[PDB]
Structure 1
Amino acid sequence: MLTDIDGIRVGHATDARAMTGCTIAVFDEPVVPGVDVRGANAATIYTDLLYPDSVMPSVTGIMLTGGSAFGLEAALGAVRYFEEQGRGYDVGVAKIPLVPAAVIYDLSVGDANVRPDLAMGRRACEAAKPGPFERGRVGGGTGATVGKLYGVRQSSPGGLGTATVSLYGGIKVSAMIVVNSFGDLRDTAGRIVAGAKYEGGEFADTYARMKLGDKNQSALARMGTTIGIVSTNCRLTKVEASRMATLAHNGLARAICPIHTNVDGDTIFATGLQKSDLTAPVDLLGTAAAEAAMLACLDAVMQ
């Protein structure tokens, strides 16, 4: 539960008829951010300010949205909302908020013509609150599917999931993940819990079938996604937040196979607090971020 971390509120906007939506994490306490874009087909906005050799931005929130490339318009909706509320970097003549975002492709379920837009991004911001939030097919996970080797028609439902890992000394690492993976999702024993299905409903085993020669028939296959946020209540430097984002992908690798494919836009954002007493080695935090991400992947499909 991402809101276990100080200062974070989460809001969804959900369109259950079109099967799309967006989710925003809003930061009421200043954060130090990082990012790792590992998939080969990602669409994002504002990620350059999240690398270690860029200046320290003022990140107002981070958004996970559907709508493919179109859905980044909801991030601009959030930017406009935050400016009206008086948040963002103060340049005297204006305040400039920043809402980095990454997308999934969810246009092949429901209505392809409806995508998160300026208004939907505002709605998610308005709805953002502390405490527990809903998981499953809501917000950015509304139109998510898993296991697209044979097309969306033989896929399993995806979703939005969350988990918190507790360490010593009050340290926490939490994740919030939208699972829309090309590949199958497995538990810790290696059983398939969501994935590509044969016509009658048994799991095919995507990787096994690909080794035998079955070819990718998903909508994006002709050009040659799991997105999420990992957050800690530790203080981080920019270099450490980017290292945490990099290590968190290991958790995706343990749950999802194949992962980081040519049709995946896999992206992890990471945050720590600018002002906190708590510190810990980044390799430990990163390992816990991997565990949190893995658990959040499973959460997405059991809710």
Structure 2
Amino acid sequence: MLTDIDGIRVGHATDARAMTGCTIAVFDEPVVPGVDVRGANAATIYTDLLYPDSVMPSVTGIMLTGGSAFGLEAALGAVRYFEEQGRGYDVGVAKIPLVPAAVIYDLSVGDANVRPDLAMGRRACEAAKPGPFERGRVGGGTGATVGKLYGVRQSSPGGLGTATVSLYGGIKVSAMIVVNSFGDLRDTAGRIVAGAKYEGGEFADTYARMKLGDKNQSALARMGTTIGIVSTNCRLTKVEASRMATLAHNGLARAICPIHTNVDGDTIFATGLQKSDLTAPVDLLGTAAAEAAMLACLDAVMQ
């Protein structure tokens, strides 16, 4: 539950008919951001300010949205909304909010002509609230699918998941993940819980089929995705935030196979608190972020 971290509110905007939507995490307390874009087919916005060699931005919120490249328009809708509310970096003649975002491809399910736009991004902001939020095929995970080796027709449903890992001294590391992965989802044992299926419904084991010569038949296979946020209540520097985001990808490799493929835009945002008394080594937080991300992946398909 990402809202376990102080100052975080989560809001969904869902279109059940078109099978698309977006999800925003709003930070009522200033955060220290980081990012790691590992997929070879990612579409993001505002990520340059999330790197250690960039200045400290004023991140108002982070959004996970559907609609492929078109869906980033919902991020601008969040920016417009937050400026109206008086949030963002005070430049004197205006306030400049910042809403980094990453997308998943969900156009092959439902209505391909409906994507999150300025209005839908605003609706998610209006709905952002503390406490527990809904999981599953909601918000950014509404049109998510898992295991597309044989196309979306033989895939399993994806979704949005979340999980919290507790450490000592009140330290917490939480994750919220939208699973739209090309590969299969496995548990800690190794059994397939979601992925590419044969015509009758049995799981085909994507990786085993590719080793035998089965070719990628997904919509984006001609040119040559799992996105999420990991948050902790510890104080972090910019380097530590980006290192946390990098180590969190190890959790995706735990549950998803194959991962980081040429059709995946896998991206992990990471946040710490600017003002906080809790501190911990970055390798423990990064390992805890990997577990939280792995647990949130399974939560996305069991909810």
The TM-score bracket by the shorter chain reads over 0.9
Secondary structure of 1:64's match?
A: strand
Q: What does residue 79 of structure 1 align with? A: 79
How far did 1:166 drift? 0.1
Output one character per residue of 1:253-295: Cα deviation in whole Å (capped at 9) or x when no partner: 0000000000000000000000000000000000000000000
How far did 1:236 drift? 0.1
Secondary structure of 1:143's match?
A: coil
Q: What does residue 288 of structure 1 align with? A: 288
How far did 1:111 drift? 0.1
Output one character per residue of 1:135-190: Cα deviation in whole Å (capped at 9) or x when no partner: 00000000000000000000000000000000000000000000000000000000
Aligned length: 303
Displaced runs of 4 or more, over 6 A: none
Q: State the alpha-carbon separation in 2 of the partners of residues 87 and 196 from structure 1.
A: 44
**TM-score when normalising by structure 1:** 1.00
Output one character per residue of 1:36-67: Cα deviation in whole Å (capped at 9) or x when no partner: 00000000000000000000000000000000
Output one character per residue of 1:57-94: Cα deviation in whole Å (capped at 9) or x when no partner: 00000000000000000000000000000000000000
Secondary structure of 1:229's match?
A: strand
Q: State the alpha-carbon separation in 2 of the partners of residues 242 and 187 from structure 1.
A: 27
Q: State the alpha-carbon separation in 2 of the partners of residues 145 and 129 from structure 1.
A: 27
Pairwise CA RMSD of aligned residues?
0.1
Q: State the alpha-carbon separation in 1 of the partners of residues 167 and 43 from structure 2.
A: 33
Q: State the alpha-carbon separation in 1 of the partners of residues 278 and 292 from structure 2.
A: 19
Percent identity over the alignment is: 100
Q: State the alpha-carbon separation in 1 of the partners of residues 28 and 52 from structure 2.
A: 22
How far did 1:133 drift? 0.1
Q: What does residue 191 of structure 1 align with? A: 191
**TM-score when normalising by structure 2:** 1.00
Q: State the alpha-carbon separation in 1 of the partners of residues 49 and 183 from structure 2.
A: 30
Q: State the alpha-carbon separation in 2 of the partners of residues 74 and 103 from structure 1.
A: 10
Q: State the alpha-carbon separation in 2 of the partners of residues 96 and 30 from structure 1.
A: 14
Secondary structure of 1:22's match?
A: strand
Secondary structure of 2:268's match?
A: strand
Q: Note if 1:4 corresponds to 2:15.
A: no
Secondary structure of 2:290's match?
A: helix
Structure 1 runs not aligned, ≥5 long: none
Q: State the alpha-carbon separation in 1 of the partners of residues 165 and 248 from structure 2.
A: 13
How far did 1:105 drift? 0.1
How far did 1:221 drift? 0.2
How far did 1:20 drift? 0.1
Q: What does residue 114 of structure 1 align with? A: 114
How far did 1:122 drift? 0.1
How far did 1:7 drift? 0.1
Q: State the alpha-carbon separation in 2 of the partners of residues 27 and 238 from structure 1.
A: 17
Secondary structure of 2:153's match?
A: helix
How far did 1:2 drift? 0.0
Q: State the alpha-carbon separation in 1 of the partners of residues 190 and 25 from structure 2.
A: 31
Structure 2 runs not aligned, ≥5 long: none
Output one character per residue of 1:197-230: Cα deviation in whole Å (capped at 9) or x when no partner: 0000000000000000000000000000000000
Q: State the alpha-carbon separation in 1 of the partners of residues 179 and 20 from structure 2.
A: 13
Q: State the alpha-carbon separation in 2 of the partners of residues 274 and 123 from structure 1.
A: 28
Q: State the alpha-carbon separation in 1 of the partners of residues 108 and 101 from structure 2.
A: 21
Q: State the alpha-carbon separation in 2 of the partners of residues 210 and 302 from structure 1.
A: 26
